[PDB]
Design a protein around this nucleic acid. Structure first.
Length: 52
DNA sequence: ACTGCTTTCGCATGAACCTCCCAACTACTTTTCCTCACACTTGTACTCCA
């Protein structure tokens, strides 16, 4: 799920910069927000973790 | 007695089905998700009523 939810998150940001004149560092800010999101997923016990 | 009913035969060689289970077309359950409203209890505000 995380491999595709990131893949769709990628396609939303790649729309913004290419068309709505967003600066290229907007993707760079978004990854740290995405990566720390994954660490919260990481901290949960893998058996029955139920990431929201 | 001659009755009936048998029966054996034939020109070479060449070519000359029945349930049953799977299919279409529907519906209704399946197998896990995220998203809050509700019921109280301590709390702070109210104005007393003598």
């Amino acid at each position: 799920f995380l491999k595709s939810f990131q893949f769709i998150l990628k396609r939303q940001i790649r729309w913004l910069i290419t068309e709505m004149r967003f600066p290229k560092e907007f993707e760079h800010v978004a990854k740290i927000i995405w990566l720390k999101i994954l660490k919260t997923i990481n901290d949960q016990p893998q058996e029955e973790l139920k990431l929201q």
